[PDB]
Amino acid sequence: REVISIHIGQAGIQVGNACWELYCLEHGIQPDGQMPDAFNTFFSETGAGKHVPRCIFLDLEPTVVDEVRTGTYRQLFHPEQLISGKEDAANNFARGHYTIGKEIVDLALDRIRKLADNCTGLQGFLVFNAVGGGTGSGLGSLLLERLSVDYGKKSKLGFTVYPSPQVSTAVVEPYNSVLSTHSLLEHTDVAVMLDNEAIYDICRRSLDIERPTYTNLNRLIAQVISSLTASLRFDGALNVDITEFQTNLVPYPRIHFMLSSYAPIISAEKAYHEQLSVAEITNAAFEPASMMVKCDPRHGKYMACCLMYRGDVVPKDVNASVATIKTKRTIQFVDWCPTGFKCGINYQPPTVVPGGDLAKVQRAVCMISNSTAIGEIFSRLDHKFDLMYAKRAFVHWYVGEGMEEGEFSEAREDLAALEKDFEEVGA
């Protein structure tokens, strides 16, 4: 029972930086890797009393990985799993994919191979990147193809930091995102999108944070991943695994883009007072204000949802809450799904991470849904891509790198076909 974590680009590496410091304290393993078998899915016992994570951090620019090498977890990772290129991809999809990628992607694959050899019962891969930049887009779209053509039969859970409409740091995101989403449509299997603006709004409302940096965001996504993998690390009255999740949700081969939500995302001062229970935590997860992608669930019918309950939850109140949420007319399920819920439960409470404002709570719900509401996401990003591509702006860098002018058109048509598929299945 194993999944190996690959982080690409600064966003993915830092998200893993929060995620691994979460796991280490959740399992009881000190920073330099020692206890004072649940870790087996993530940590592997090496030597005596030493544990090493099943992860590889990879980037082209070296200083972001040097941060990890010089931080507090310097003893933890294998000293080679912290890959470093020599020159940054410079937020250029062509440069990251073709020019620089070749020298380092083969090394990445030759390390993934020995990680898998050390593992025995692999479920699969979990990858971290962002489709807005150049590194995590080009290297992602190459490495994912490499894994899908080498291992092929494995499941690659891709947690992608999709770029938000209004808030956007970069300027070539409308190009980089379409160039990534050509491959991400048909090489991975489940792509959990995340949106910085949506998570900013969640932090602003629930946690009353008016200066939300990347650290709090990263802790939040780390908690989501921990809730996703708790069913495998631990035991519960009603559990779920990778095959469970990934064959329950994905209706058609080319419709897999999750919407993620979490509860109770509550600070200590409100968590000490306001009471918590399943029958209101489930509705709280479904509320749009607490969904992690800048999307509108009201516009799109729900197709299939999955719920996960960490902490002490008996399997009856989840049934009651599913009833009391399916009885509400505001949210509409898709017509052909008479039952559209997959519930899973655990016996471990979320572990409060020191250094954050997240509460120590008795129970928590992580929600992963699949719904047609995300059509406007693709439509609007493609609209702004059209805005940029009308006058052939910024194309000269990619052309000089080697990419012609026609692959942009083919990828744009691929995105258009994706939108047509979503409309057809909404019908």
Binding site: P62, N196, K384, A393, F394
Partner: protein, 426 residues
């Protein structure tokens, strides 16, 4: 791992670079002697981008001074912090270009360029991974315009996959000090548009206005102008030496800014600039930094950005900060001033953060705009060039030294289409 070699052309370039090294050596914590005596390790952790260890803790900068006089080099050495330089880099003639482009590009340039490329090759070979060069020069002289242009062209014929940050102090009319500035400026921009990859426009007129208005100085000598320019030059490139939450290096900035293959002329600002009386009566919030950063009386250019649209913009913040606060600030700015932004580029602005601010200032920021108002400076120099050239004033000093008449007209045409492309895209 990434490397930058810094070259100083002419007297203006030499002084600006000397002050730049005086600033950056302190920001890295090393004293004028060359032996580190600072406090932390975040300084030393990536100083290999500028300095080379010589013999047991003696760090020497990767800079090359070059001109056609010995007096400027003597002044630079006599000044403070001038010891660190390697004496081998000190290359110079004895005659002097004499504000003559023909001397600075054809005779003395030819007789010194072979020697100077030897030392630049030595520096570019002693390194491991180059990302781009820096050049500091003017556009209104002989040792700075013509010779710097020849040097950058000779570099391009050798390293065709690298950038150059050419900081060009444009000759402003109201601060003009020589009779023939345009005959140098036009003929320099001719090849600046062809070879150099990031030309940073600066002007003594805007620098003096900044010093008079904001700093409220009483006797601003060249020291403080060089101080501001050095602060900008050191702030633009901290994304290498320091680790930030969102890191963005030189190639990323270039690809983000330059939309079309020849529109590389950046207009630059810096925050916060305060008088030492009002620095006790202000709040350095991120919105305040952004408002000062977009304050049109703060960009280091005589062309007011209100006279045109913004092709794109970039901000480089320094100091522990809030990335969401940065992004929402720039979004508010763009939404409020949407009429100043190109319509066929959504989200015209880029933002980056570094976790280390310049010392003393607990928080700072830098602005690099690509606004189309830049055409104002070029039309304002083209008017003077045409006015002189109509009757071939001061022209024999170049014709007798080896330039036909058609070269000036071709330079006129290149300058005209350069200033016309911005109008076309506006």
């Amino acid at each position: 791992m990434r490397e930058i070699v810094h070259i100083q052309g002419g007297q203006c370039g030499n002084q600006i670079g000397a002050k730049f090294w005086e600033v950056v050596s302190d920001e890295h914590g090393i004293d004028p002697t060359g032996t580190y005596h600072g406090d932390s390790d975040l300084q030393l952790e990536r100083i290999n981008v500028y300095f080379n260890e010589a013999t047991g803790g003696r760090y020497v900068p990767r800079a090359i001074l070059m001109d056609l006089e010995p007096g400027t080099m003597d002044s630079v050495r006599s000044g403070p912090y001038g010891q660190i330089f390697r004496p081998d880099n000190f290359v110079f003639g004895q005659t002097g270009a004499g504000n003559n482009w023909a001397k600075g590009h054809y005779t003395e340039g030819a007789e010194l360029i072979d020697s100077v490329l030897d030392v630049v090759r030595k520096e570019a070979e002693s390194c491991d991974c180059l990302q781009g060069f820096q050049v500091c020069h003017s556009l209104g002289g002989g040792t700075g315009s013509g010779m710097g242009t020849l040097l950058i062209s000779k570099i391009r014929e050798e390293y065709p996959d690298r950038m150059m940050l050419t900081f060009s102090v444009v000759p402003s009319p109201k601060v003009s000090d020589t009779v023939v500035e345009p005959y140098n400026a036009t003929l320099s921009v001719h090849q600046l548009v062809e070879n150099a990859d990031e030309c940073m426009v600066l002007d003594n007129e805007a620098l003096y206005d900044i010093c008079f208005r904001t700093l409220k100085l009483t006797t601003p000598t060249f020291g403080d102008l060089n101080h501001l320019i050095s602060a900008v030059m050191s702030g633009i490139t901290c994304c290498l030496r320091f680790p930030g939450q969102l890191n963005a290096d030189l190639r990323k900035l270039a690809v983000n800014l330059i939309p079309f293959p020849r529109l590389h002329f950046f207009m630059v600002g810096f925050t916060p600039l305060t008088s030492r009386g009002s620095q006790q009566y202000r709040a350095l919030t991120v919105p305040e930094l952004t408002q000062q950063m977009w304050d049109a009386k703060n960009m280091m250019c005589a062309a007011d950005p209100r006279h045109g649209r913004y092709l794109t913009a970039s901000a480089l913040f320094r100091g522990r900060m809030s990335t969401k606060e940065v992004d929402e600030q720039m979004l508010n700015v763009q939404n409020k001033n949407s009429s100043y932004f190109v319509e066929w580029i959504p989200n015209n602005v880029k933002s980056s953060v570094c976790d280390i601010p310049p010392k003393g200032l607990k928080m700072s920021a830098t602005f690099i705009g690509n606004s189309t108002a830049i055409q104002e400076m070029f039309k304002r120099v083209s008017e003077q060039f045409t006015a002189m050239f109509r009757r071939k004033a001061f022209l024999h000093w170049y014709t007798g030294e080896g330039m036909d008449e058609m070269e000036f007209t071709e330079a006129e045409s290149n300058m005209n289409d350069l200033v016309s492309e911005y109008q076309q895209y506006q």
